[PDB]
């Protein structure tokens, strides 16, 4: 990068979160499903309140629907926002059983500064390591059927349209490339993660591609 470098350089002694998801979902259409290219994606954050505490619950949710299948990805900090800045699908508009690829990424601090989670002895890292919850879930839209660094997440799926799920997820120091280690390097997997990491990076030969990128600043 031009900036990312200069930034990580000018910001040696603190840590900003970057969260990254990659997920291949195996799909199975309803016999009454009609092929379609439509894609709807959306990001929505929110700042609800931990009554007991003086500390706000932050939450970012990404969502996307394509090929009869809708996905929802929900990251919930106690006292820390990790804003999703972007989501991307790769999907196949046919009746064919097929794959659906879902990227989701946080903001780059060097686009817009996230919190330095290291401030005050790593207060933030406490908050994440201990508190942060992640909730993925997958459904079938409106289609009708004939009747410790272990990242802490929940996957619920409607199995009618969902054949398979593979994903690699990470919540890591947004400059770990320019650092030996970091106190924020959380990771998660489910089925061939390292595979779907490889594969997502180029499904754009054989799918429609839609995506949403939030305004920078």
């Amino acid at each position: 990068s031009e900036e990312k470098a200069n930034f990580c350089s000018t910001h040696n002694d603190e840590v900003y979160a970057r969260f990254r998801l990659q997920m291949r979902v195996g799909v199975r259409h309803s016999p009454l499903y009609t092929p379609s290219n439509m894609c709807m994606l959306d990001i929505e954050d929110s700042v609800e309140d931990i009554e007991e505490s003086t500390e706000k619950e932050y939450a970012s949710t990404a969502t996307g629907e394509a090929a009869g299948v809708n996905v929802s990805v929900a990251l919930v900090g106690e006292g820390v926002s990790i804003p999703f800045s972007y989501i991307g699908l790769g999907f196949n508009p046919s009746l064919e059983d097929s794959y659906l690829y879902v990227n989701v990424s946080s903001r780059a601090p060097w686009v817009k500064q996230t919190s330095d989670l290291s401030a005050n002895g790593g207060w933030g890292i406490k908050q994440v390591l201990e508190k942060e919850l992640l909730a993925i879930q997958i459904g079938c839209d409106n289609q009708k059927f004939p009747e410790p660094a272990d990242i802490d997440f929940s996957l619920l799926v409607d199995p009618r349209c969902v054949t398979s799920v593979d994903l690699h997820v990470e919540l890591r120091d947004a400059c770990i490339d320019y650092k030996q280690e970091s106190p924020l390097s959380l990771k998660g997997k489910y089925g061939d993660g390292e595979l779907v990491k490889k594969e997502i990076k180029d499904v754009g030969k054989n799918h429609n591609m839609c995506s949403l990128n939030l305004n920078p600043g």
Partner: protein, 60 residues
């Protein structure tokens, strides 16, 4: 009806929660509890974690 392929190893915030639901065996291989939220988000802890069974007792 939906089915959980994974579980939260932490325990969810008491204040934030709302509804509860329990799986359909024939469908979902793992029996588990699905927790909605004030946020309208359905986290799901695989029970045996008493933390869950208590929360559900708070629900009931």
């Amino acid at each position: 009806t939906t089915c959980c392929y994974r579980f939260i190893n932490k325990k969810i915030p008491k204040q934030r929660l709302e509804s509860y639901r329990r799986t359909t065996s024939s469908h979902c291989p793992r029996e588990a509890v699905i927790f909605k939220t004030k946020l309208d988000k359905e986290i799901c802890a695989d029970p045996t974690q008493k933390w869950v069974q208590d929360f559900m007792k708070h629900l009931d």
